Amino acid sequence: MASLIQRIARQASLTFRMQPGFPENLSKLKSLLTQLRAEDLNIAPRKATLQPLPPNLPPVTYMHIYETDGFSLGVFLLKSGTSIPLHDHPGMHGMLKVLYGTVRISCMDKLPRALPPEQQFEPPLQPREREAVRPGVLRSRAEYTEASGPCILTPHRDNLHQIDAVEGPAAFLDILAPPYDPDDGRDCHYYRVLEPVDLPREVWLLETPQADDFWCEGEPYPGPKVFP
Amino acid sequence: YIVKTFWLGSHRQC
Ligand SMILES: [Co+2]
C-alpha cells in the first residue's frame, strides 16, 4: 500500500533511531534500496547535452526527500563530467543507490604519522601543506550502476569517498545517518589524494577547501512524498 | 554564500 520511498524512509527510521537489532534492520534497508528504481521517484533518466556547462549553473543538484534527527534522505544528480569531490562523513553511516547512469566511487580512510622529510609530490606542496598531509588508505575504486547493490560507508571504514559521473549524467539516492550537523562537530571536509614522486594501498591525504568549481543547488523532488 | 545543510554540511552554494 505504501510507496517504496515511504517504506524506505520508515525502515531508515527504524534502523538509525551497534545496538541490538541494528544489523537485521540495516540488511532490510539495503534490500529495500536494492529494489528502488528511478521511476519510483518520478525521476526520468537524464542524458548528456553535449554542450559545455555555463558558468552560472551548478555541476550537481540535490533533491531533498526527508530528514529526521536520525537520517537524511535525498537524491544527488550529477551532470556529465562532474564529481562530488573526495570528502568525509565524521561519525556517520551512509548508503548510496544509483538511479541512472554510471558512477565511479573511490573509497578511502584516514589512518598520526608525519610525512617523511624526503617525500615529494607532483604538483609540489607549499610548506604549510607539507605539515598538514596525513596518511590514508585507498580501499576500492569501482563503477556502479542501478544494477549494483547499495554502497555503504560507516564511521570507521570507507568513510572518505569521491563520486564521479562516468560517460554522462548520473544520479543516486543517498541516506546519511545521522545527517551532517556543523554546529555539533559533524561537518563535511574535503580532501586531495596526493601523487608522490594495487588495492588496498597507502596514500597521502590533504584536507582542502571546497573546490571553486564544485557546488550543489537544490531542485524540486518530483516523487511520492514521505509523510509523518 | 555558506549554507548549513543536512546532506553536505557547511556548503558554499555558489
Ligand atoms: Co558522501
Residue numbers in the entry:
A (entry chain A): 6 to 22, 43 to 136, 144 to 229, 240 to 270
B (entry chain B): 1 to 14
The paper states:
N-terminal cysteine oxidases (NCOs) act as enzymatic oxygen (O2) sensors, coordinating cellular changes to hypoxia in animals and plants. They regulate the O2-dependent stability of proteins bearing an N-terminal cysteine residue through the N-degron pathway. In animals, the Cys branch of the N-degron pathway is regulated by the NCO 2-aminoethanethiol dioxygenase (ADO), which also plays a role in cysteamine catabolism and taurine biosynthesis. Biochemically, ADO is a non-haem iron-dependent thiol dioxygenase (TDO) from the cupin fold family of enzymes, consisting of a conserved double stranded β-helix (DSBH) core in which the active site is situated.
A crystal structure of ADO in complex with CP6 was obtained through co-crystallisation to characterise its binding mode and evaluate how differences in CP sequence can influence the means of inhibition. However, two crystal structures of unbound ADO, which were published during this investigation, highlighted alterations that result in an amenable crystallisation construct, including metal cofactor substitution and surface Cys mutations. The peptide sits across one end of the DSBH core of ADO, blocking the active site entrance. CP6 binding is mediated by a number of intermolecular interactions, including pi-stacking between the sidechain of CP6-W7 and the sidechain of ADO-Y87, pi-stacking between the C-terminal amide of CP6-C14 and the sidechain of ADO-W257, and hydrogen bonds between the sidechain of CP6-R12 and the backbone carbonyls of ADO-Q252, -A253 and -F256. Additional changes in ADO structure are largely restricted to amino acid sidechains including, most notably, ADO-W257, which rotates to stack with the C-terminal amide of CP6-C14, and ADO-E92, which adopts a distinct conformation to avoid clashing with CP6-F6. Additional electron density is observed around the active site metal, which was modelled as Tris coordinating cobalt in multiple conformations. CP6-K4 and -F6 interact with ADO-D215 and ADO-E92, respectively. While there is no immediate rationale for the functional contribution of the former, CP6-F6 promotes formation of a hydrogen bonding network down to the active site via ADO-E92, -H89, -Y87 and a water molecule, which is not present in the peptide-free structure.
